[PDB]
């Protein structure tokens, strides 16, 4: 119940370079759930790719 | 040369450990968080807490 963040910046090609950032200990989630991705593009304008 | 500068690195010397600057003290270090602090509008300000 702890939701640990590890981000890899893409300064590098280096996969696990992780950092951590943030993270929500005693998290309660949905035993069994779905899987999403959503991204937005407003008013300005971000290309959202993700490639795995 | 690992891209992680600037950042905040919390190193504690017994006494009888070098600091290697060259790798920015990479291996000694304790702890390390990843936060620009250079031409600020504000000045910057860090709270230390030492407890238990």
């Given at each position: 119940?702890?939701?640990?963040?590890?981000?890899?910046?893409?300064?590098?090609?280096?996969?696990?370079?992780?950092?951590?950032?943030?993270?929500?200990?005693?998290?309660?989630?949905?035993?069994?759930?779905?899987?999403?991705?959503?991204?937005?593009?407003?008013?300005?304008?971000?290309?959202?790719?993700?490639?795995? | 040369?690992?891209?992680?500068?600037?950042?905040?690195?919390?190193?504690?010397?017994?006494?009888?450990?070098?600091?290697?600057?060259?790798?920015?003290?990479?291996?000694?270090?304790?702890?390390?968080?990843?936060?620009?602090?250079?031409?600020?509008?504000?000045?910057?300000?860090?709270?230390?807490?030492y407890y238990q």
């Open positions: 119940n702890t939701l640990t963040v590890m981000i890899n910046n893409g300064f590098t090609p280096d996969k696990n370079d992780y950092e951590f950032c943030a993270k929500v200990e005693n998290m309660i989630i949905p035993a069994q759930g779905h899987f999403g991705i959503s991204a937005a593009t407003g008013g300005l304008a971000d290309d959202h790719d993700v490639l795995s | 040369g690992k891209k992680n500068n600037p950042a905040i690195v919390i190193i504690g010397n017994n006494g009888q450990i070098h600091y290697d600057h060259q790798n920015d003290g990479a291996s000694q270090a304790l702890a390390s968080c990843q936060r620009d602090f250079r031409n600020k509008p504000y000045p910057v300000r860090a709270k230390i807490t």
